[PDB]
Ligand binder design. Structure first.
Ligand code: ANP
Ligand code: ATP
Ligand code: ADP
Ligand code: MG
Ligand code: MG
Ligand code: MG
Lengths: 1195, 400, 249
């Protein structure tokens, strides 16, 4: 407290002097203790007990004196009860730096997000909203003349209320002219709307309508002619026509929101006037008029809080004149009318309100809207797990003292202890409120108080408590008799949609509403149960707003086209000759299709056609980006297609991802593994780079390979030393823009599982705030170019908050076709030479078409011939595809994925062409002829198909796949009567040769007879060793799985040690294994070198590849969200080829480092199934028991 | 089957009002059955033919086995005098559980009044209430005094602590602790197990409900000017009864069991007071046309009673009841509170204009209430009965 | 049900597929639990905690909570539940045979017992969309007209669908007109749900809107039916007496 702000010492000089004296004594004592830290030595210090008791007494006195000072400051300015002790100390302590107070005005006030200061921060000229709307004080508050924070802040609040009252008086005086008129000039009306604040505009229009209707009814009481009400309705309709004409035009966002609020108001006013005319009310005291919320403005009243009266039925409140900023007005449906009536009746009866119903029915929104209609400050307390229990008493005292409203989002979500305590507090406050209703009470002196925070807190009559509940349950037994319940169970979505569509300029608002509400019901009940699906009222409102935006952009496009031509321009004419249904369907599709799984798109379009018959959705044409995408896909060997062509779904997915990047700043790709997410966003980044000319940089940050502290940074509590985490370091580097980071498109991709632990700090970044709050206290603003991107497999352990804050693009596995992967493999084989490493790798980028480099190497020619021969088998219905479907039919030791098998097959084919190369090198005189090379490659393709699709399968299923291949192929398979095809090797020549021929007959010495390093070569041993050599030539994370005792560990170790340039490191994994084990292994066996490209982690021994034999891949335990952190680390290091140092926050690229794993079947106890994003890269082989012949040979 | 077809009076029996008292002979046996055998055979026959009468037949079975006066004590009013004096030990709390909305503290208040034993009544729920409770418990245990602890269902953990305190405590011979509750699952099992339990339920019926309503509302409140005020309360009282009794016949009466209770009645009385005071403005008499019928109907249909109602058909039923009762026609001499009652003769609203006249009319109501009073069909009772009958059998399965 | 290219476009097929998918899983669960109970009662299986509590509930008649994955009447015993389950699964087998051998269009001509279905409101939604798709009508311009036909095998129009098992509580439907009845409940022989184009004709004073509740507990509302009042009967009498329609009794 006394070393955080210098002004705290000035506020409390006696206490500062006292603490300085104590601190001196305490530091001397602690030095004495540090000299002799033994507990017996400390206990033997002379008079230590008495000194510590005296220090405890004095320190308690200062802490109390400080608490009393804080309580006095809170009592002087009751709104300070809404900020904590640290925030309050910051507010009063930072008196000179007024600009530090602007971050707390949102907690204290309703719509006041900041205050506008003078040149020298000595005069408060007014207040400002979060949107930007400003209120200029009539008489500015001078801080210099009132230096105390409480004094000038109270003057700011009082001048807020006075200025709002005076501006409302002026606005009402102006709008009475429009009310008493038959033709409102659009320009004058728009000028009036621009002049006054949104809440004052809506309130003035409400006041004018109420006065006009009351005068009309008073006249008809004697006259008996319905002419005055007809005039009122005609005026409302004329003003509504003017508002519609204005809202079709192009308006500033603030004026647009004001127009929408005014339209929502006037629709309700026209409805009420029509009801009054239809029911033939002639008296102003009839309940058909009394039940409507009426506004009686009395400008002559000296007290601003008693100038405007809002009366509904019996109840009669006063406008609190609280600046609400630009709030979201609600469509005044009959359900909301009933809510207003019930809550006002409860408030007049001094009872609280309890709207109950299913979530999303507008309960807390209706409570907040009623509070804002009365000019009150409503605080909504979310009763989820993130509930401030310790602050509840302070906030309750604040509500009682300032006369603010308090709404609980879902009071039944609280746990039993919090529920009971908050119920007791609500009960005492509501009993205090009931004590205001006794007529015998003396109103001259009314100090009604309640027992809050163990003190008598005065309760203002204007405050109220609302308890929104969700049945399935009921109010606590103590609050049942103090609260009036209301069933808000079915919002009138049709009228909400109709009024919002009318406010967006749609002429056929009613038809479109009656179409779009049942359609959203259909989608919510006919689309696959998905967590990211949201067809509620909020989503419907967002869709309607987007449809209005689409309508206005079409209008602007037509207007610009006509301006370019010689044709005249008329906004209303353009709006009339314009399809509203097509715009609504376009908005619905553009909002929902990216989130849809492959099965739900046909369903969505079927339900759509059912509701909108004959209306077709045509996707926007994007020829420039399409051609850039095609060029990038050609460059990256990817497959491109338009519409129904191969790659069409992938291209439409990348276009959807682009539109989501345009709309949102945070977004997710939640397709399954191997569905084209990474290629989609990389190709989009490169296409945008080539199209817009803005450089694109991506920061793939696996959030689970590192801890939360290593991701967001941490500060030492002992020394207050701050460390930047990986994400914070990246964001800070972008913000600083030392090398023009703001001039480059920065995408922060995460590429890891999403859980409600590492995204909590990201919630404010993904929200509209676009701000990262650090435990240090820094507030890092998200730059406009930065795009936070999540590439995930699923959303099983993701919060609805994170899903809602982010755009959604679902990459169903149908997006990526097997033909697309086959084409990619063939193009890469025909283009990229296998033998060439660093050379001819950058030459691919340096050459746009690589003219004159067709014969780059003999390797390239050999693999081009191989691709030519393998082309027939990699067709749409070729051998590989049918074999893959059959393998999908079979059962495997691991969860089968298409890309695991396909990658294993491609690596085996690469090894086949490498074998052709080594044969050519060993026989310069006789190059391997075309016929022999065709035979060998066909046979090796069959071999690779069997060993890649049935590698996980048992011997029976390997035989089944071999028989299926034999049935469905024409290549010459071995003619063995009773020997499996997988028992044969393809030699260099096209002929097969049994594996048993390659098995030698070794002899073991007398000792070491059963040594743990002797491996007797058998058919399985040599076969698996060949597979290891194949898949380790390409440095894949080969995994052998099988029952215990089969020989996985010994075969792996023997084969790895057989390789000369190979350092084998055994890393036994267990449930306690974490990535720090791999980091320790890298520290022990490797070194980091700062190459010009970047940090490279390479083995200390040059010219040798380090293999990390991880003996039990399955064992590492999953989190409570089902994720093995070390497995994710290995996946990152094998996919992205590197990781991130937790000390430097820099990318470290691996060099000459491999991974090999062994497992027991995942069905065994203690073994967890590996993630599909990890299994995609690993080739898994089922090492079954050797069998009678192999056992016979070995033993 | 053969005996059913051959019997001629089977049709008149199956349609009889009380078939259990005249069950005919439809079982074949080698030797004549004992009275309990005939009772069980008639119980089976009633269950097969007229399940609604099963409960009544069940009673007869008990009457044939445990005597005709086995249950006869229960219909008699509870006599707490002897039970508290002898049966209940000083360290055994008397738990007095009422249905939600009902009160049972008045019983022991009158018990202590007639016993001339000092009793201290304490309302539980607040910390000051807890301190008053435990200090009064200590004073009474050391002085042989009676303690009332009202609405102790509000503090379950404090109830557990009280049970633990009573277990070790050794009271005086005249100490008596009464704890009143509204039957909640929150009540500790150990407290219920270690205390005498008394369950209180209100006497069902429109007459009893209206008598309770008139007792709860003060006479002076109903007596305030204008003189029409009393009549309004009568209608309101009637309305309250008509809905609460209808709650017994759910789901046919109300689609679900709403918590229409004292809170709604107080809110409706307050609404009537406010609106009638606004309309009358001090006049001693106002015309029946001047009463804000629309205001009362709307506030009771959407705010007072309609707040709990979430079904649209239940809201429609509530609106129909309110539009039928609260009109100017209710101030006529021939207004019919309930039509087609029992299929013949209909309830007429009392002609009087004073509170005592309305209470007298309530007290002279015939003790022959049928669901036709509530607007329900007269067979609704039968449905209720058969449900209860099935329910009994289900409970009898759970005791197996 | 065997999902094909043409069958997936049928809303009725999709509904029936979801229904049978739920029913088969519930069938397997209940049958396995009963087999375990039989094994324990035969003496060859040890009473585990789940087995012990299941046996206790079956002996006491309490409906197991692991069972009843669909909407069921509250407080209902195990015997009623297994009887209703047998009837529902028999209906599901009939609809499965109709879908496999009778063709997709037969699903339009088959009479469906709303009580047997787990989600009959989804069936009513499907029927509406079917009519809309066949007649190229927009979905929201369709309103439901109910025609009670006492004739056996009454002809079904293109937009008229047959529904059986409907019970009328406290009323009798003669010539598609309701009369107040002192009977406990009457059974509607065959209800033709006909999805007609909505018309702005004012609803008559002799027309009553009756809720079609899922079961006798009146806890789930499926839809509403507009019926015609017969003779001089006030609709307020229908409202007060609690007249309604039940999918199952
Ligand atoms: N080809 C072989 N030559 C020699 N011994 C073999 C051979 N195959 C299996 N064995 C024996 O079988 C056992 C295999 O041990 P090991 O290689 O540790 O099995 P594993 O597959 O790693 N089983 P686990 O780690 O328990 O899941 C040893 O006792 C070996 O001696
Ligand atoms: N447009 C394309 N044309 C051809 N092949 C493609 C295309 N997109 C992707 N592929 C192939 O499919 C593979 C998987 O694609 P990608 O790496 O984008 O998957 P992902 O969705 O990010 O999966 P994971 O969850 O494993 O990270 C690529 O490595 C490539 O071989
Ligand atoms: N009368 C209305 N006009 C406009 N929108 C409404 C109306 N009623 C409800 N909504 C919308 O319905 C959603 C319900 O959200 P909210 O009320 O916060 O949750 P709950 O309904 O569970 O309390 C809100 O997003 C709100 O925009
Ligand atoms: Mg909500
Ligand atoms: Mg990826
Ligand atoms: Mg091993």
């Amino acid at each position: 407290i006394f070393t955080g702000s210098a002004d705290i010492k000035h506020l409390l000089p006696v206490e500062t002097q006292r603490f300085q004296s104590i601190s001196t004594e305490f530091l001397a004592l602690m030095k004495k203790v540090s000299k002799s830290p033994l507990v017996m030595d400390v206990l033997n210090i002379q008079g230590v007990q008495r000194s510590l008791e005296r220090l405890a007494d004095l320190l308690g006195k200062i802490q109390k004196a400080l608490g009393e000072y804080l309580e006095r400051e809170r009592s002087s300015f009751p709104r300070f009860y809404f900020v904590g002790d640290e925030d309050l100390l910051e507010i009063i302590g930072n008196s000179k730096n007024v600009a530090k107070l602007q971050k707390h005005f949102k907690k204290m006030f309703a719509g006041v997000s900041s205050i506008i200061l003078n040149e020298d921060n000595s005069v408060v000229l007014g207040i400002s909203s979060r949107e930007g709307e400003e209120v200029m004080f009539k008489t500015p508050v001078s801080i210099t003349e009132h230096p105390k924070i409480n004094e000038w802040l109270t003057l700011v609040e009082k001048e807020m209320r006075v200025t709002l009252a005076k501006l409302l008086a002026e606005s009402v005086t102006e709008v009475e002219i429009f009310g008493k008129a038959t033709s409102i000039d659009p320009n004058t009306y728009i000028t009036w709307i621009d002049k006054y604040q949104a809440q004052l505009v809506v309130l003035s229009a409400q006041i004018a309508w109420s006065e006009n209707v009351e005068t009309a009814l008073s006249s008809m009481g004697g006259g008996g002619d319905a002419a005055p009400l007809h005039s009122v309705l005609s005026n409302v309709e004329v003003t509504l026509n003017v508002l519609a004409d204005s809202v079709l035009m192009e308006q500033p966002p603030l004026r647009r929101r004001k127009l929408e609020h005014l339209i929502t108001e006037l629709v309700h006013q026209r409805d009420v006037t029509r009801s009054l005319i239809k029911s033939k009310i002639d008296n102003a005291k009839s309940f058909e008029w009394l039940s409507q919320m009426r506004f009686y403005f009395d400008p002559k009243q000296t007290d601003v809080l008693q100038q405007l009266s809002i009366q509904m039925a019996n109840a009669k409140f006063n406008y609190g004149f609280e600046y609400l900023g630009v709030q979201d007005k609600l469509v005044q449906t009959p359900l909301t009318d009933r809510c207003y009536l019930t809550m006002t009746q409860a408030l007049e009866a001094r009872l609280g309100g309890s709207p109950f119903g299913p979530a999303g029915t507008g309960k807390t929104e209706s409570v907040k809207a009623l509070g804002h209609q009365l000019g009150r400050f409503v605080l909504v307390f979310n009763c989820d797990e993130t509930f401030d229990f310790q602050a509840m008493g302070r906030i309750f005292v604040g509500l009682c003292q300032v006369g603010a409203w308090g709404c609980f989002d879902e009071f039944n979500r609280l746990e039993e202890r919090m529920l009971s305590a908050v119920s007791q507090q609500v009960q005492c406050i509501q009993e205090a409120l009931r004590e205001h209703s006794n007529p015998n009470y003396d109103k001259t002196s009314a100090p009604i108080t309640c027992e809050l925070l163990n003190k008598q807190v005065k309760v203002s009559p204007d405050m109220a408590i609302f308890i929104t509940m969700n049945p399935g349950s009921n109010l606590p037994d103590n609050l049942k008799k103090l609260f009036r319940s209301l069933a808000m169970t079915k919002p009138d979505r049709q009228l909400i949609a109709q009024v919002m569509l009318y406010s967006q300029g749609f002429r056929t608002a009613e038809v479109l509403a009656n179409k779009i509400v049942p359609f959203f019901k259909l989608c919510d009940e006919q689309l696959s149960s998905q967590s990211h699906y949201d067809f509620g009222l909020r989503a419907l409102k967002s869709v309607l707003v987007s449809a209005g935006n689409v309508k206005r952009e079409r209008i602007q496009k037509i207007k610009r086209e006509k301006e370019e031509r010689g044709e005249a321009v008329d906004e209303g004419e353009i709006a009339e000759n314009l399809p509203e249904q097509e715009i609504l369907i376009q908005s619905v599709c553009e909002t929902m299709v990216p989130k849809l799984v492959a099965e739900d798109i046909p369903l969505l379009f079927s339900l759509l056609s059912d509701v909108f018959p004959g209306v077709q959705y045509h996707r926007g044409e994007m020829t420039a980006l399409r051609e850039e995408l095609k060029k990038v896909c050609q460059e990256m060997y990817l497959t491109y297609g338009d519409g129904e062509e191969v790659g069409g779904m992938w291209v439409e997915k990348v276009l959807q991802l682009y539109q989501i990047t345009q709309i949102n700043h945070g977004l997710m790709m939640v397709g399954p593994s191997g569905s084209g997410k990474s290629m989609a966003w990389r190709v989009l980044l490169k296409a945008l780079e080539r199209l817009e000319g803005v450089e694109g940089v991506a920061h793939i940050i696996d959030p689970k390979a590192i801890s939360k502290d290593h991701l967001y940074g941490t500060l030492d509590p002992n020394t207050r030393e701050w460390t930047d985490g990986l994400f914070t370091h990246v964001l800070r580097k972008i913000i600083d823009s030392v090398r023009g980071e703001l001039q480059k498109r920065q995408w922060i991709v995460f590429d890891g599982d999403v859980d409600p632990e590492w995204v909590e700090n990201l919630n404010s970044v993904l929200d509209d705030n676009k701000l990262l709050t650090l435990p240090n206290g820094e507030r890092l603003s998200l730059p406009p170019n930065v795009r936070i991107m999540f590439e995930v497999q699923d959303l099983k352990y993701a919060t609805l908050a994170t899903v809602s804050r982010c755009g959604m693009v679902w990459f169903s596995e149908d997006v990526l076709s097997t033909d697309m992967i086959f084409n990619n493999f063939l193009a890469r084989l025909r283009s990229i030479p296998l033998d060439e490493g660093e050379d001819e790798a950058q030459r691919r980028r340096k050459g746009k078409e690589d003219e004159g480099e067709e014969a780059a190497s003999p390797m390239l020619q050999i693999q081009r011939d191989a691709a030519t021969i393998m082309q027939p088998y990699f067709t749409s219905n070729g051998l590989v595809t049918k074999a893959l479907e059959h393998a999908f039919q079979l059962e495997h030791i691991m969860d089968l994925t298409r890309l695991r098998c396909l990658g294993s097959l491609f690596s085996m084919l690469h090894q086949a062409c490498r074998n052709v190369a080594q044969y050519n090198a060993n026989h310069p005189d006789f190059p391997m002829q075309i016929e022999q090379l065709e035979r060998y490659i066909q046979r090796y393709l069959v071999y690779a198909i069997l060993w890649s699709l049935s590698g996980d399968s048992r011997l029976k299923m390997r035989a089944e796949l071999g028989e299926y291949i034999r049935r469905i192929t024409t290549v010459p398979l071995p003619t063995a009567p009773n020997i499996p095809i997988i028992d044969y090797e393809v030699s260099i020549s096209g002929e097969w040769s049994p594996w048993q021929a390659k098995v030698p007959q070794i002899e073991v010495e007398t000792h070491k007879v059963a040594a743990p390093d002797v491996v007797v070569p058998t058919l399985d041993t040599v076969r698996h060793e060949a597979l290891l050599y194949t898949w380790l030539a390409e440095h894949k994370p080969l995994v052998l799985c099988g029952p215990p005792g089969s020989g996985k560990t010994m075969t792996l170790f023997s084969a790895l040690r057989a390789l000369p340039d190979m350092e084998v490191v055994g890393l036994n994994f267990s449930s306690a294994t974490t990535p720090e084990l791999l980091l320790k292994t890298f520290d022990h066996y490797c070194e980091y070198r700062r190459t010009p490209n970047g940090v490279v982690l390479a083995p200390v021994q040059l010219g040798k590849w380090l293999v990390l034999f991880c003996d039990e891949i399955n064992l590492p335990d999953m989190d409570k969200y089902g994720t093995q952190r070390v497995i994710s680390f290995i996946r990152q290091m094998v996919e992205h080829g590197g990781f991130y140092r937790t000390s430097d926050q820099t990318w470290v690229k691996l060099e000459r480092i491999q991974f090999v794993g062994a497992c027991n079947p995942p069905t065994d106890p203690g073994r967890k199934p590996l993630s599909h994003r990890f299994l995609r890269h690993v080739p898994v082989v089922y090492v079954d028991y050797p069998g009678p012949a192999s056992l016979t040979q070995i033993y | 089957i053969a005996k059913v077809q051959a019997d001629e009076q089977f049709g008149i029996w199956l349609d009889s009002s009380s078939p259990e008292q005249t069950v005919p002979y439809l079982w074949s046996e080698e030797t004549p059955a004992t009275p309990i055998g005939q009772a069980i055979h008639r119980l089976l026959l009633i269950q097969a033919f007229r399940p609604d009468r099963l409960l009544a037949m069940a009673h007869m079975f008990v009457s044939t086995n445990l005597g005709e006066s086995f249950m006869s004590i229960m219909e008699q009013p509870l006599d707490l005098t002897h039970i508290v004096g002898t049966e209940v030990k000083p360290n055994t709390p008397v738990l007095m559980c009422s249905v939600p909305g009902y009160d049972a503290s008045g019983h022991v208040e009158d018990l202590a009044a007639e016993q001339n034993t000092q009793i201290t009544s304490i309302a539980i729920g607040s910390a000051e209430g807890f301190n008053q409770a435990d200090k009064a418990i200590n004073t009474a245990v050391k002085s042989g005094r009676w303690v009332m602890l009202k609405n102790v269902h509000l503090a379950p953990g404090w109830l557990m602590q009280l049970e633990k305190k009573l277990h070790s405590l050794q009271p005086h011979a005249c100490f008596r602790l009464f704890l009143t509750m509204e039957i909640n699952p929150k009540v500790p099992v150990n407290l219920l197990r270690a205390g005498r339990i008394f369950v209180f339920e209100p006497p069902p019926g429109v007459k009893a409900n209206m008598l309770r309503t008139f007792s709860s509302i003060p006479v002076s409140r109903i007596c305030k000017s204008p003189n029409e005020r009393a009549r309004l309360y009568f209608l309101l009282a009637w309305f309250h009864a008509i809905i609460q009794e209808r709650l017994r016949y759910a789901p046919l009466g109300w689609s679900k069991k709403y918590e229409f209770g004292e809170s709604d009645l107080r809110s409706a009385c307050d609404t009537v007071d406010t609106w009638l005071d606004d309309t009358a403005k001090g006049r001693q008499n106002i015309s029946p046309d001047k009463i804000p019928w629309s205001a009362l109907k709307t506030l009771m249909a959407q705010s007072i009673y309609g707040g709990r109602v979430d079904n649209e058909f239940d809201q429609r039923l509530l609106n129909t009841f309110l539009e039928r009762l609260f009109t100017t026609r209710s101030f006529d001499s021939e207004f019919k509170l309930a039509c087609k009652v029992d299929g013949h003769k209909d309830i007429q609203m009392p002609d009087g204009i004073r509170r005592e006249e309305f209470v007298q009319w309530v007290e002279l109501l015939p003790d022959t209430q049928t669901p036709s009073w509530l607007g329900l069909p007269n067979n609704a009772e039968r449905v209720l009965l058969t449900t209860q009958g099935v329910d009994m059998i289900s409970k009898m399965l759970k005791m197996q | 049900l065997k999902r094909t290219v043409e069958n997936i476009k049928d809303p009725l097929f999709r509904f029936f597929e979801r229904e049978v998918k739920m029913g088969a899983k519930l069938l397997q669960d209940v049958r396995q639990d009963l087999a375990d109970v039989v094994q324990v009662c035969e003496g060859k299986k040890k009473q585990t905690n789940y087995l012990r509590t299941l046996i206790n509930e079956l002996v006491k008649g309490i409906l197991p909570r692991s069972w009843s994955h669909y909407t069921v009447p509250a407080g209902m015993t195990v015997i009623q539940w297994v009887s209703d389950f047998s009837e529902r699964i028999k209906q599901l087998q009939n609809i499965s045979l109709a879908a496999a051998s009778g063709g997709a269009k037969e699903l339009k001509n088959i009479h469906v017992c709303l009580g047997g279905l787990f989600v009959p409101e989804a069936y009513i939604t499907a029927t509406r969309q079917y009519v809309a798709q066949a007649n190229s009508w927009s979905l929201e311009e369709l309103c439901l007209e109910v025609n009670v036909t006492t004739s056996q095998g009454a002809t079904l129009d293109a937009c008229s669908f047959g529904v059986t098992g409907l019970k009328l509580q406290g009323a009798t439907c003669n010539n598609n007109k309701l009369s107040l009845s002192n009977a406990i409940s009457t059974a509607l022989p065959l209800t033709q749900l006909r999805w007609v184009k909505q018309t702005n004709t004012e609803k008559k004073a002799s027309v009553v809107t009756l809720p079609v509740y899922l079961n006798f507990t009146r806890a789930d509302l499926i839809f509403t039916v507009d019926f015609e009042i017969a003779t001089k009967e006030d609709p307020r009498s229908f409202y007060e007496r609690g007249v309604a329609v039940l999918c199952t009794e």
